[PDB]
């Protein structure tokens, strides 16, 4: 009892003033010692326990408590003695046996007692990393037969469980001690290390083993040396990536220098003989090295060593070089189709990363890429990069910034479509992350466009195609595309708010999206853990036993993120969510797609109707559950927009009734209220039915009816364009910008024909091209 | 821990200095010298209840292997359906078994279904 | 869990309720006890109504 210690001592004194009997006083002192141990009084607790023990040692609980107290203090002999006494008094325990075994192993005893105790502990606890470590220590503290039995135990443990980083490291160390470099290389080249190379220590040990093997075997001779050099380059790239993900500028610079000398040694053999996949591997590794150099430059700029005004150009040049590195070539020789595919995927991933980082460095503008291409992309920029990276430690022929493969950048800007096509192949190595998802979302949102992440989602998780229209979300496994898009929108908004809040503490020259390795926390820890649990449940990364809690968390989070009828959210937040949903949905035009979107809009309006009635009488709306938005200036209470929202809901209901079959109610609501959403939906339905008609053979009458439908759609689009030109507010009122309407008008003019239309138009193309 | 001057239950030192656990229950249950209990501890449903209570895996899979080696001279269609549903519930909750016994359970279930 | 309070008080029911959260062994023990009691209650059946067919008085 830590608190009320004065009252505790008063009660103790009052009990001792009337207590008697030797055994009763002994157990009272033991209780006082327990209270002192609870209130953090190890000295008094040990003193009272010893006083109770001296009066006839007994009680296995008291014995193990005295042993724990002695182990906490610092009496190993008395601790192990009390532990042995408690274990002998108790009917064969397990924790006491394990503690005794570990204490004897730490004290280093090579006797029959220790052997029997370790055997009993291993029989009581199957496997156990501590038991395995104690067994390894006991087998290594012997000799030649000890080394043999240790190797046998290591092989048995590896056969029992392959995913064992500690067992792999112990086997590598034993091979290096016994000069089994060939066996170490054979164990390292196994294709099962894709799940074990996530740690920096294992990759560094693999790199050291490969370097030792190369130094022992001198030069090359067969394809085994080429494969070993390729695996060493891959392990070094992984080492540099992990050091960049970690927070250590010195370790990052050391890994960069290691990768540089490895690339130099690889090019020294490439320029000699063996011209196959080694050149492509060297190209991808040089691109990855440029990417890592740019990442290290950004990391040191964030850590504040050199100002951003002198680093926003070298990093851009590095990213441009990594993007414009020679493309991978087809090398199907030596039977390495999977290797060629992996190299192509790595090259695509490097291209996508370089393009994304260059776009973030250029921010919303795109002239920075051309400026870096036409100015900083030269020998002066190469020398500046070399001085900023290695200074004067290495030479020009040893490094790559200045000599070896210079001048190869093509005059082109990485477009969003090229970035998406590169990500389509990039999302196959180590899948994707929420950081990269928010990166892509922000990149696609800062240009008044929507992210076409449908292909990315189908690539990372091949399930549930096309955005569906549901009423509730409670399936943690099969995640919906619409819910994923809403979650991405929310995370992008949160990241934008975090960047706007953090930009007041550093320089504004920093990119809009920080890199994934050097920065993994740019949003809310709740959504971070949610995405982590989702990725674990998807890729089977979670341990066998932790899944129900993650599923329950996902179910409780989705039912609040997708909103309901009455929960306690805000009408402004619901309107923003509906606008984002409409913006993400209206890009895909189809019959069933438009039907599902109209159904979702009707459901949203029906859910908002109980909340829209409170605004009519001016009622205060409480704060929402999800704290992903701030109440500063983005979220507020609607004043006069309730009437516009009700009119939009009535228009949506009228369009739904017209689609169904309630023409009377549709025309009644149209005569009541009028808007542009109904006209847009009617034009979309007309274009869809015209395309469905044109899909088949059309005689004269069908061709004239198709031309009439096209003329009606063109008249609707002309009315929309006239309403937009009369006042510049349609692009802000409708969820889609004026670019969508312009593209629709262009498609209509292209489908009308060129010089063979049976019906002459009666309008003029405004802010568009003339096709027919 | 408080006071021990009047033993309410006459328990000697052999019972006072012994911390009882959970395996001792099964120990004395198997050590029951009565012929009735000895025969009841060797059937099917009693051992199933014991394994469900103990939440074991090694002895459970060993007894299942012995059952599969013996054959279908004890299990039936309803028994196999209940076992499959229990295994599915356990796999949905947490942990799993072995691929060999899993595919054996699946093949026996589909064989009983096609029968 | 977390332990910090160990001072006893009157009525052993409070100490029993406090120790119930300290170890789950007695928890599942009393759970199995209540389960067996419910088993016996369900197996008894309509004995309460069957008694009325021969319940005495004197």
UniProtKB/TrEMBL annotation, chain A:
<protein>
    <recommendedName>
        <fullName>Nuclear pore complex protein Nup153</fullName>
    </recommendedName>
</protein>
<comment type="similarity">
    <text>Belongs to the NUP153 family.</text>
</comment>
<feature type="repeat" description="TPR">
    <location>
        <begin position="60"/>
        <end position="93"/>
    </location>
</feature>
TrEMBL record, chain C:
<comment type="similarity">
    <text>Belongs to the nucleoporin Nup84/Nup107 family.</text>
</comment>
<protein>
    <recommendedName>
        <fullName>Nuclear pore complex protein</fullName>
    </recommendedName>
</protein>
<comment type="subunit">
    <text>Part of the nuclear pore complex (NPC). Forms part of the Nup160 subcomplex in the nuclear pore which is composed of NUP160, NUP133, NUP107 and Nup96; this complex plays a role in RNA export and in tethering Nup98 and NUP153 to the nucleus. Does not interact with TPR. Interacts with ZNF106.</text>
</comment>
<comment type="function">
    <text>Plays a role in the nuclear pore complex (NPC) assembly and/or maintenance. Required for the assembly of peripheral proteins into the NPC. May anchor NUP62 to the NPC. Involved in nephrogenesis.</text>
</comment>
<comment type="function">
    <text>Functions as a component of the nuclear pore complex (NPC).</text>
</comment>
């Amino acid at each position: 009892m830590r608190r009320s210690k004065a009252e505790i001592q008063r009660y103790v004194e009052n009990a001792q003033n009337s207590a008697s009997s030797p055994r009763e006083k002994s157990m009272k002192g033991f209780l006082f010692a327990r209270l002192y141990y609870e209130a953090k009084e190890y000295e008094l607790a040990k003193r009272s326990v010893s006083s109770y023990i001296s009066v006839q040692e007994r009680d296995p609980k008291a014995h193990r408590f005295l042993g724990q107290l002695f182990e906490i203090e610092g009496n190993v002999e008395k601790a192990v003695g009390c532990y042995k006494r408690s274990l002998e008094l108790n009917p064969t325990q397990k924790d006491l046996t394990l503690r005794i075994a570990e204490l004897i192993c730490t004290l280093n005893i090579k006797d029959g007692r220790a052997e029997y105790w370790v055997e009993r502990a291993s029989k009581l606890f199957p496997g156990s990393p501590e038991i395995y470590r104690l067994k390894e220590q006991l087998l290594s503290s012997q000799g030649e037969a000890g080394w043999n039995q240790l190797f046998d135990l290591i092989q048995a443990e590896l056969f029992a469980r392959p995913n064992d980083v500690y067992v792999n490291l112990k086997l590598v160390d034993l091979f290096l001690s016994n000069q089994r470099l060939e066996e170490a290389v054979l164990h390292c080249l196994k294709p099962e290390r894709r799940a074990l190379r996530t740690d920096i220590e294992w990759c560094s040990c693999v790199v050291r083993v490969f370097k030792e093997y190369l130094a022992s075997k001198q030069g090359q001779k067969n394809t085994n040396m080429r494969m070993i050099t390729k695996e060493l380059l891959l392990a070094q790239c992984d080492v540099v990536f992990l050091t960049l993900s970690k927070k250590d500028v010195q370790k990052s610079k050391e890994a960069l220098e290691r990768f540089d000398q490895a690339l130099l040694s690889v090019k020294q053999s490439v320029s000699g003989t063996d011209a196959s996949d080694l050149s492509v591997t060297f190209y991808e590794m040089r691109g990855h090295y440029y990417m890592h150099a740019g990442t290290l430059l950004l990391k040191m700029a964030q850590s504040c060593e050199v100002q951003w005004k002198a680093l926003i150009e070298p990093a851009a040049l590095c990213y441009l070089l990594a993007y414009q590195v020679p493309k991978p070539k087809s090398k199907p020789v030596k039977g390495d189709d999977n290797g060629q595919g992996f190299l192509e995927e790595l090259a695509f991933d490097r291209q996508s990363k370089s393009g994304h980082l260059l776009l973030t460095l250029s921010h919303g503008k795109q002239n920075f890429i051309s400026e870096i291409i036409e100015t900083f992309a030269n020998q002066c920029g190469q020398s500046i990069l070399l001085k900023f990276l290695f200074e004067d430690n290495l030479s020009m022929q040893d490094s790559f910034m200045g000599s070896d493969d210079i001048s190869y950048v093509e005059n082109r800007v990485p477009d969003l479509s090229e970035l998406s096509q590169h990500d389509n192949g990039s999302l196959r190595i180590h899948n994707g992350d929420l950081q990269h998802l928010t990166w892509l979302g922000l990149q696609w949102h800062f240009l008044s466009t929507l992210p076409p992440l449908r292909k990315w989602l189908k690539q990372i998780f091949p399930r549930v195609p096309q955005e569906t229209s549901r009423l509730e979300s409670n399936i943690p496994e099969s995640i919906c595309l619409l819910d994923l898009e809403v979650f991405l929108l929310a995370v992008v908004q949160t990241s934008y708010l975090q960047l706007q809040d953090n930009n007041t503490t550093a320089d504004p020259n920093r990119p809009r999206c920080l890199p994934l390795p050097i920065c993994k926390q740019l949003f809310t820890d709740r959504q971070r853990s949610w995405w982590d649990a989702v990725y674990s449940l998807i890729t089977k990364k979670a341990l066998p036993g932790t899944s129900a809690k993650l599923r329950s968390v996902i179910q409780h989070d989705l039912t609040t993120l997708r909103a309901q009828e009455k929960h306690g959210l805000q009408p402004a937040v619901l309107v923003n969510w509906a606008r984002g949903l409409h913006k993400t949905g209206y890009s895909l035009n189809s019959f069933y797609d438009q039907k599902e979107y109209m159904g979702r809009c009707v459901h949203y309006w029906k859910k908002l109707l109980p909340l829209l009635d409170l605004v009519k009488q001016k009622k205060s709306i409480p704060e929402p559950v999800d704290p992903l938005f701030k109440h500063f200036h983005n979220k507020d209470i609607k004043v006069s927009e309730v009437k516009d929202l009700e009119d939009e809901a009535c228009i949506a209901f009228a369009t739904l009734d017209l689609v169904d079959g309630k023409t009377e109610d549709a025309i009644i609501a149209f005569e009541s209220v009028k808007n542009v959403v109904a006209y847009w939906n009617l034009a979309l339905i007309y274009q869809r039915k015209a395309e469905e008609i044109e899909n088949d053979c059309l005689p004269a009458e069908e061709q004239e009816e198709f031309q009439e439908c096209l003329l009606k759609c063109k008249g609707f689009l002309k009315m929309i364009c006239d309403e937009y030109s009369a006042y510049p507010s349609i692009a802000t009122s409708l969820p889609v910008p004026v670019e969508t309407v312009f593209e629709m008008l262009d498609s209509v003019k292209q489908s009308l024909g060129e010089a063979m239309d049976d019906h002459s138009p009666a309008f003029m193309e405004n802010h568009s091209v003339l096709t027919t | 821990s408080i006071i021990s001057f009047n033993e309410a239950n006459e328990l000697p030192r052999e019972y006072l200095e012994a911390n009882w656990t959970l395996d001792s229950v099964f120990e004395e249950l198997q050590a029951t010298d009565k012929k009735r209990v000895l025969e009841e501890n060797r059937e099917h449903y009693h051992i199933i209840q014991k394994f469900v209570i103990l939440a074991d895996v090694d002895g459970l899979m060993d007894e299942f292997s012995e059952w599969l080696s013996n054959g279908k001279n004890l299990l039936l269609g309803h028994l196999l359906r209940f076992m499959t549903h229990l295994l599915l519930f356990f796999r949905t909750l947490g942990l799993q078994a072995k691929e060999e016994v899993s595919v054996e359970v699946l093949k026996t279930y589909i064989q009983r279904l096609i029968n | 869990n977390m332990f910090e309070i160990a001072a006893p008080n009157a009525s052993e029911k409070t100490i029993v309720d406090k120790l119930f959260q300290r170890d789950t062994l007695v928890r599942q023990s009393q759970l199995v006890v209540d389960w067996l009691e419910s088993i016996a209650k369900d197996e008894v059946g309509d004995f309460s109504d069957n008694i009325e067919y021969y319940a005495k008085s004197v």
